[PDB]
Amino acid sequence: LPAGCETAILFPMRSKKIFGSVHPVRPMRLESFSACIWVKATDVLNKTILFSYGTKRNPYEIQLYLSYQSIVFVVGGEENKLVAEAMVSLGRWTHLCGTWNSEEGLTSLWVNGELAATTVEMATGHIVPEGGILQIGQEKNGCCVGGGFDETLAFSGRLTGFNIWDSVLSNEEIRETGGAESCHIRGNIVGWGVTEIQPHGGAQYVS
Amino acid sequence: LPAGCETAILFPMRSKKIFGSVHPVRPMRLESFSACIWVKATDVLNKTILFSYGTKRNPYEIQLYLSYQSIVFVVGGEENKLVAEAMVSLGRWTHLCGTWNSEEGLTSLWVNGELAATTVEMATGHIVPEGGILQIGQEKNGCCVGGGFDETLAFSGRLTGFNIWDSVLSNEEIRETGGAESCHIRGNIVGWGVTEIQPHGGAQYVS
Fold it and tell me: Which Cys residues form disulphide pairs (chains A, B)?
């Protein structure tokens, strides 16, 4: 098995209930930070939401969503985003993960350990609100209503290796994280298997 | 029961799940409206949202709550509000009505069939857009988290006569709704026994 890893989460079916609730230990107020997740894209539509962190006044504080052929990253609001062109596939575990800084508004995208896109002065000086809900594999919306999660925004596949840092990673650490010896470097904000991660509405763990 | 009805809710305990969901049948679009209700609050805090219309982008789209010995009438967003003083008392049925106009933002309130507040240029030309939800006694917080709802803003007490109108009601109808046989008088947007009501988390019909 790869990464030295030991566990994974299955989203067997895109629907209006399948999701998981994430409960980070520490506050999410960060100015410069890093995080990574690996993804095995089963379906890629015009939009496929990878995760969602959304606060009451701004459900789009942070959100990564996948389009037909592009990896679109959003900071602060819909206006500021980062997008690649032709580096997303189907039926394969894939690595997508990037850094940001408010001091001078840098944001970037790293696919399989190698930079893919970047923009400067992006949400410069922005400070993310904290105490919100960090949602994964689905945009913030209802689940217990009976459905509720518009399936177009849902995602199908196997997800794992979610780790968030409170600081921007270096390039060598990025390659380390993108290799087959990466499961051991887990995030302080979120450590895979450390932060409580409970699948719901169809999802189950797999290893 | 207050005047001639026999059905009421019971709100025995303001908690992290007690609430009710209403799912009206007809469009919510209104340039003006009217809204009689009778209310029996057990304990009144500085903020207790009896009911409000909320959208994903505007949870304070229409609203009224009791502010200790006061009645706020939140309009459009939090900023636009019409407030009255020293009318509601604990353990007492009180007929609250109210009126609005987008001709020039006229808004008014009426306690026990008698004026409770008034002002103009509130929500001038405002149009409540459609597709949102009306909720009663609860405000936006988690519900399927084994609780979550702000117990502080939850309610405990008795309710009845929950009806709404598509337009402004005059002083004559406002007073008649405070009459002794208003149980047969109900609005068009919502009429008691006509629109769907599903109490939750402790709310009990006392029929």
Answer: 5-183, 36-97
